[PDB]
Design a protein around this nucleic acid. Sequence first.
DNA 1: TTTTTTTGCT
Length: 214
Amino acid sequence: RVPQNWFPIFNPVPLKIPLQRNVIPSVTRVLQQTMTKQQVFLLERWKQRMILELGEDGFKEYTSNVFLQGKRFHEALESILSSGYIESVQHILKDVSGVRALESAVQHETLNYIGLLDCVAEYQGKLCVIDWKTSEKPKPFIQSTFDNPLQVVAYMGAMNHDTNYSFQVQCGLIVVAYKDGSPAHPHFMDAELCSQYWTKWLLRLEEYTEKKKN
DNA sequence: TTTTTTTGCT
Ligand SMILES: [Ca+2]
Ligand SMILES: [Ca+2]
């Protein structure tokens, strides 16, 4: 009936303060709104062909399942580092240690974006930001993970210039697990390769911010 | 909220 956390309302050219969360995008938002004419094609062609094979209500249910399987997977690791997918990654967890961060936020003070990275930990003695994920079809080459490398280096560059973090990171790791328990493909990205993908991430970033001008 | 997940052949 009464407030428990009291604070008063008063205290004894027009302003237009922008809202930071509006003008500072998220990594996933930068990439999803700067997809290539090829990505849009195969994605639209994949939805039309899947809705035809499962209907509108079914394809909406499909989206729900594969979304939850992932989210539950990510949470499971968040607990472990503190199911069929878990058996698939067991041969990778043996090589991971030195966990410095999990489901933690990164903000780029200068390039002005933000994100939530899955994990920061040592893989075979190499500190990288790690990007877990489930997948139905197999992904044997880093090319099969599409924009995921960009998402990873966006997170790295953000952390390396986020004063909430006392350390830097130079490598990236994409782990693709499978429901049938097949071992997980580890797609590692050494410092040099992350510099390659980083340059391409700046392009997507700059394409996005130009898109937001109009 | 962010993120979860989704991508061909001739
Ligand atoms: Ca995530
Ligand atoms: Ca992930």
